[PDB]
Design a protein around this nucleic acid. Structure first.
Ligand code: K
Ligand code: K
Ligand code: K
Ligand code: K
Ligand code: K
Ligand code: K
Ligand code: K
Ligand code: K
Ligand code: K
Ligand code: K
Ligand code: K
Ligand code: K
Ligand code: K
Ligand code: K
Ligand code: K
Ligand code: K
Ligand code: K
Ligand code: K
Ligand code: K
Ligand code: K
Ligand code: K
Ligand code: K
Ligand code: K
Ligand code: K
Ligand code: K
Ligand code: K
Ligand code: K
Ligand code: K
Ligand code: K
Ligand code: K
Ligand code: K
Ligand code: K
Ligand code: K
Ligand code: K
Ligand code: K
Ligand code: K
Ligand code: K
Ligand code: K
Ligand code: K
Ligand code: K
Ligand code: K
Ligand code: K
Ligand code: MG
Ligand code: MG
Ligand code: MG
Ligand code: MG
Ligand code: MG
Ligand code: MG
Ligand code: MG
Ligand code: MG
Ligand code: MG
Ligand code: MG
Ligand code: MG
Ligand code: MG
Ligand code: MG
Ligand code: MG
Ligand code: MG
Ligand code: MG
Ligand code: MG
Ligand code: MG
Ligand code: MG
Ligand code: MG
Ligand code: MG
Ligand code: MG
Ligand code: MG
Ligand code: MG
Ligand code: MG
Ligand code: MG
Ligand code: MG
Ligand code: MG
Ligand code: MG
Ligand code: MG
Ligand code: MG
Ligand code: MG
Lengths: 133, 211, 148, 159
RNA sequence: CGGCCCGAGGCGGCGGGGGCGACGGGCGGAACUUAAGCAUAUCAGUACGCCCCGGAGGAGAAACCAACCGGGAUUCCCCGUAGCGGCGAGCGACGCGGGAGGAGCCCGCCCCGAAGGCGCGCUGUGGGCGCCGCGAGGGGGCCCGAGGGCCCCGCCCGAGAGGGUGCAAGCCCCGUACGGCGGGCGAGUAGCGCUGCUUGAGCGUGCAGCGCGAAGGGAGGCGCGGCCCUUCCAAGGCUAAAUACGCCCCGGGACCGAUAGCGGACCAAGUAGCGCGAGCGAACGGUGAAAAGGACGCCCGGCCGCUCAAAAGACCUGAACCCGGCCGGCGCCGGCCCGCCGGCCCCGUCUCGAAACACGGACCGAGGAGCCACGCGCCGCGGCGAGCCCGAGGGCCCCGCGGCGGAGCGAGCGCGAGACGCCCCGGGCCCGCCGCGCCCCUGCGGGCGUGC
RNA sequence: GGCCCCGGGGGCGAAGGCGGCGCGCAGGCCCCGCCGGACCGGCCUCUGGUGCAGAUCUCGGCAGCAGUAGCGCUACUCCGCGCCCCGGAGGACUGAGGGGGAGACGGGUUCCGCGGCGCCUGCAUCUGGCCGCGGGUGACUCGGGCCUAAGCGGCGGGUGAAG
RNA sequence: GAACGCCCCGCCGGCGGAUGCCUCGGCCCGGGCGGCGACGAAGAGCGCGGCGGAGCGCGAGACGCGGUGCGGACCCGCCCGCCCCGAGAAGCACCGACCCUCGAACGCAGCGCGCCCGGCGCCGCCGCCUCGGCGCCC
């Protein structure tokens, strides 16, 4: 049961917030679980999906694994390499079947200066909570 | 609503019915016209509340508490009490903070099947009510009544469970649906202060027992 | 509750108990109380004698707490004595330790005489007495008294 | 609105801790024939009441007493009842882990009446033999005197 | 020729003006309507027009109320009849009592005279809540286009509020529970006379014009003159709180669900469109999980067929009225298996009387009319009972005044009920009002009687 | 608001739609087949904007009538692949108060060139004031700016509760 | 007779948009807040994008410019551009500027003209400069 009275529990307002969200909120809402192997190494549970990661898909009719070529933030979907619409011609181009990030599990992460730091920032706060508890 | 437009009757002599019409001839301003007002609009001055005397409010709580001391009326209200030691069920707990420990007591006594009865019943309701913030329904289980011990943190999350401090007992909790016989889990200090509570009501005597 | 009302039993009846010959119109007698001396005179004389006219003196501003005047009968006097003490007083019909009852403390001014008292001396202090309240009190051995 | 007012007087009480939220107000008689014999809370204390204990108006306002210089005492009992009320409060006051007093300070309480005893013989010498005639002579005294004068001038004119 | 007085033009610094569908203050000010007609009255000191502020405003520290064994500035809440009136219809305050809140002061006059804010002033200055962030825990088997489904075994819970995700998810993802930062006392006056408006204010509630014009004065719900008593000090000024409210932001709901709900759910509504103008003012929501939004071939738009679970193909479902192709047959009720026999005027309505040459109605769909608030009477049921009671307010629980009932009658001074009775009805007697024998004390007062 | 005995029915197919049996004096209810593709209830207590054939009812759709009633300004024809467009030849009309050539007012891009026929051009169209894409109006001397007409504003102030 | 019309013994098509389910919208109650303007408001006009009509936004510095923080891979089409332990796309909050014509609307007018080489409206308060009077005096 909720206790905070500045937070809506109204379906109409909650649905309006899923749409019409700004771009920084939409990125966070497109997260996925890290694999067990990365959970031990990084000590984090989920991560926001990104162009350049490798994902293992389940629960769908397009199961498989591949790299993230595109992010359709308006749709909350991601295009993976190798997961296409079944095509008509033998020659014609591939057409990506778009996957929802929560149907995925990340197997390897794209790394740069900002992604190392935001992980380390998130571990130190999760250790504040583990000291309070 | 319905009266922001401008409309007047055309009168007889033009082969049309006599209701008010907008410029152009469109029907307006009647309950039988598209876009018109209601015949008698709803108003907030409806009397929403009702009065009850203080004597009759105390009778209802006492009669609803007496129903809770029968194992045949609790059963016929809907609960599962076939594995319970006593239906006037008093239990010594004295402090409960983890839900895991509080689940262990309710099992350790025999009210485990009533909370699973409630847990496995959650569903989406049948009508328009699921657009109006009333989307799910669960059945109602035990009521824990406490006096001086922290139990609310460990009991509250359980499906179909409610919490009452003994000094202020609620009739809408004792008779869900307007049916009297709820199953009640008394803490020891709650059950042993019932008479003190009824002694704290000034110039009140309980009603006379009958056959 | 709308669902137990007489008016919902008339769906399908063309006219909801108001008749075909007469019907339901706006105000076939006028509004309010009008007509009491002309076409409702048979009603006003049968049930409201003394509705029309004037009677008596008028006071441009009445003092509500001057004209206030509470009263008590002598048959209610012994109930002002608490029950724990009444038995003993009756037991010893004393002339030299009689009970004193001051009725203004209980909020009465005048003492009237309906009823009767027990055979027991008692003293009653008030602001005014009726003539047979005094007579029945002296019949018992009691005394009346005036108080500030 | 009930929650708003309770919140306003919780904040005000911290800002004056440990002063109470109320001033000490006097005990006065409810005003009419219908309500005398019982007391209630008044507006302020008089300067004659304040002269009794030894406080000036500015001095008593400082330690929590309300002072109403517009009121005048109507009797000697009005003074003794309120001087005793002033004297008592000065005992239970400390001037600088301290206790803030709730509600009205020294509430006014009106006693339920009691029965008393006496002697029949010492109460008779208080009253005449016919009390009802005694009352009826006083009630009609002005009216009888007017009719008495009217008759007396019916004969001076009629020689 | 300088000073003072009364004016003129210019220059510098500073201030004003306009704006708002509420709440607030000041003015001007209707008619419809009701009275079963209509003039006074009512609607209403309302609509609407003009002016002026603020975050509140206005009001305010007695020329007050009262008649007490008295209260004590203003505002707001609970509570209840004096009176006004073609005395008709209607209209209508307030004190006492219970609570919220509580706060008190100044100038003029008088004393000192520039001690002051010093180009001025002696025609008088100065003193007396919002910003951050972490955030637990589910697998295996059947099946489907797709598992949030079914079967069987578990974990988290200070978190089973909820939203998303290809079909009902605590454990797939965001959140939810548990916490850190900033924090000596007023004059063209008061009053009075005449006149107009206003009020419950009644030989004047409040205001105003004009004429007159005080010294101790004002008030005490019926006028005038006299004597007392009780209680206040007008004609100058400031002041927090408790109270009211749209736009806009935030939360909630036994509310509406696309002819409903705002006129306005639709990338472009006060929009398109109409009127010289003031102004008037619509209609239109929905493919699919994914645009995968339609292959290859054959004839010269069609065919075949491709994507997809499915064309769902310009889109969900897709009723009625009405219509086209193939197949069968030639109004309601009743009997018989079946085209014969028997019965049958057009409904709704007003009306003594309708099939009427009395009126409404081509057809079909959706919408479409005794609900709510307050007051009065009677009946039923619940609780308690000479008592009863969730006022307002204060701490679905606890505490909580009036009020109504308990005694009536009388214009009023006022006086004031026991004697009977299962119940009901009647009789008799007692209380008040109107009359009258008789006796007496404290006396046009008491007692005891008689009568409508 | 409750219950629906291991916790009510549902993609192994909900609500709705179309036909067909049964049950009830009746209002109505229940089942089956086909369609449809995501939600729905039986019993107890509570609540109301709660039931249509009619109102010259309101809004929307739409039939017969019915391939019906109907389509001033003298006029076109031959050939060019040929349309009422374009060309050539013929025949006529407006008839200098013009069906001619130009301005004022009003309209506002209708002007021009190239393309085109989905809408419009009440028949047709290859035409066009229609649709798409590009373009287009040059002043010392012409008009407006200036002057005053009939008028209309302003004016220390005056008046009115104000405007 | 056939056909037309009518009924339906059934199987398919049209026209129309009811019913059912769905909802970034309304409505009701409560809580906050009470924050405009000559330092040019509210409102109106015109203009501004690489390909640009409407609406939102902005003002010739125009579909935005700067500064401090935060954030960390995108930017709906076609292009551009960014990409990295900082090199920095989307997004967010505060702060500093730019700010065409009309409007209380301010040189006159409303689109045309002046006086003067800074500029150039009305009212009021306080000061100051320069002055008038057969007002009272000298
Ligand atoms: K209107
Ligand atoms: K009509
Ligand atoms: K009509
Ligand atoms: K009660
Ligand atoms: K209760
Ligand atoms: K009737
Ligand atoms: K009749
Ligand atoms: K009438
Ligand atoms: K009438
Ligand atoms: K009458
Ligand atoms: K009279
Ligand atoms: K008026
Ligand atoms: K009127
Ligand atoms: K009239
Ligand atoms: K009238
Ligand atoms: K009148
Ligand atoms: K009137
Ligand atoms: K009348
Ligand atoms: K108080
Ligand atoms: K998922
Ligand atoms: K004077
Ligand atoms: K005067
Ligand atoms: K009046
Ligand atoms: K009168
Ligand atoms: K005069
Ligand atoms: K008097
Ligand atoms: K008066
Ligand atoms: K008077
Ligand atoms: K509409
Ligand atoms: K009729
Ligand atoms: K008729
Ligand atoms: K007739
Ligand atoms: K008929
Ligand atoms: K006929
Ligand atoms: K006929
Ligand atoms: K008729
Ligand atoms: K006729
Ligand atoms: K007819
Ligand atoms: K009388
Ligand atoms: K025809
Ligand atoms: K062309
Ligand atoms: K004036
Ligand atoms: Mg009409
Ligand atoms: Mg409507
Ligand atoms: Mg339904
Ligand atoms: Mg009938
Ligand atoms: Mg009918
Ligand atoms: Mg009638
Ligand atoms: Mg009649
Ligand atoms: Mg009728
Ligand atoms: Mg100036
Ligand atoms: Mg009206
Ligand atoms: Mg009338
Ligand atoms: Mg009438
Ligand atoms: Mg009339
Ligand atoms: Mg009035
Ligand atoms: Mg103020
Ligand atoms: Mg009047
Ligand atoms: Mg003031
Ligand atoms: Mg609508
Ligand atoms: Mg369809
Ligand atoms: Mg008639
Ligand atoms: Mg007729
Ligand atoms: Mg007709
Ligand atoms: Mg309908
Ligand atoms: Mg409803
Ligand atoms: Mg209705
Ligand atoms: Mg119909
Ligand atoms: Mg000719
Ligand atoms: Mg052209
Ligand atoms: Mg044509
Ligand atoms: Mg020229
Ligand atoms: Mg634009
Ligand atoms: Mg200008």
């Amino acid at each position: 049961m909720k206790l905070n009275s500045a937070v809506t529990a109204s379906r109409r307002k909650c649905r309006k917030a899923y749409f019409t969200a700004n771009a920084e909120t939409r990125a966070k809402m497109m997260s996925s679980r890290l694999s067990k192997e990365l959970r031990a190494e990084h000590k984090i549970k989920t991560m926001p999906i990104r162009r350049g990661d490798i994902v293992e898909i389940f629960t769908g009719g397009h199961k498989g694994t591949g790299k993230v070529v595109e992010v359709r933030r308006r749709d909350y979907k991601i295009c993976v390499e190798g997961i296409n619409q079944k095509a008509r011609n033998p020659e014609a181009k591939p057409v990506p079947y778009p996957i929802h990030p929560s149907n995925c599990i990340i197997k390897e992460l794209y790394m740069n200066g900002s992604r190392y730091r935001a992980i380390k920032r998130r571990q130190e706060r999760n250790a504040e909570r583990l000291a309070r508890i | 609503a319905g009266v922001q437009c401008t409309a007047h009757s055309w009168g007889p002599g033009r082969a049309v019915a006599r209701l008010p019409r907008k410029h152009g001839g469109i029907g307006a301003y009647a309950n039988f016209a598209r876009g018109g007002h209601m015949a008698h609009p709803t108003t907030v001055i409806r009397r929403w509340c009702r009065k009850v005397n203080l004597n009759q409010r105390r009778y209802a709580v006492a009669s609803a508490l007496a129903a809770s001391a029968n194992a045949a009326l609790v059963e016929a209200r809907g609960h599962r009490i076939a594995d319970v030691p006593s239906i006037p069920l008093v239990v010594d707990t004295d402090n409960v903070t983890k839900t895991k420990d509080a689940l262990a007591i309710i099992k350790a006594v025999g009210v485990l099947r009533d909370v699973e009865r409630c847990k496995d019943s959650r569903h989406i309701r049948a009508g328009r009510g699921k657009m109006r913030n009333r989307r799910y329904i669960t059945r109602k289980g035990p009521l824990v009544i406490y006096n001086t011990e922290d139990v609310a943190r460990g009991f509250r999350n359980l499906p179909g469970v409610d919490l009452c401090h003994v000094s202020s007992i609620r009739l809408l909790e004792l008779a869900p649906g307007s049916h009297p016989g709820r199953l009640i889990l008394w803490t020891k200090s709650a059950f042993a202060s019932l008479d003190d509570v009824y002694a704290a009501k000034q110039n009140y005597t309980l009603p006379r027992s009958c056959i | 509750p709308t669902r137990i009302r007489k008016s919902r039993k008339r769906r399908g009846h063309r006219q909801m108990g108001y008749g075909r010959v007469g019907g339901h119109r706006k105000h076939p007698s006028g509004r309010g109380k009008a007509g009491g001396l002309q076409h409702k005179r048979t009603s006003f004389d049968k049930y409201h004698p003394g509705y029309f006219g004037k009677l008596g003196m008028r006071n441009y501003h009445v003092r509500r707490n001057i004209e206030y005047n509470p009263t008590i009968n002598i048959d209610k006097i012994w109930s002002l004595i608490p029950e724990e003490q009444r038995d003993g007083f009756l037991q010893r019909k004393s002339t030299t330790e009689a009970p004193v009852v001051d009725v203004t403390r209980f909020g009465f001014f005048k003492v009237l005489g309906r009823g009767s008292l027990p055979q027991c001396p008692i003293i009653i202090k008030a602001r005014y007495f009726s003539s047979d309240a005094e007579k029945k009190l002296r019949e018992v051995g009691g005394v009346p008294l005036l108080v500030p | 609105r009930k929650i708003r007012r309770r919140q306003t007087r919780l904040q005000k009480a911290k800002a004056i801790f440990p002063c109470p939220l109320q001033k000490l107000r006097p005990s006065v008689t409810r005003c009419s024939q219908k309500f005398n014999l019982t007391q209630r809370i008044g507006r302020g204390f008089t300067l004659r009441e304040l002269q009794g204990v030894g406080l000036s108006a500015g001095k008593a306002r400082q330690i929590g007493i309300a002072v109403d210089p517009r009121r005048k005492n109507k009797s000697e009992e009005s003074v003794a009842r309120n001087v005793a009320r002033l004297k008592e409060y000065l005992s239970k006051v400390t001037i600088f882990q301290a206790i803030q007093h709730q509600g009205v300070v020294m509430p006014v309480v009106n006693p339920k009446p009691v029965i008393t005893t006496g002697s029949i013989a010492e109460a008779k010498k208080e009253v005449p033999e016919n009390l009802f005639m005694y009352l009826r002579n006083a009630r009609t005294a002005r009216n009888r005197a007017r009719l008495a004068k009217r008759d007396a001038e019916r004969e001076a004119a009629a020689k």
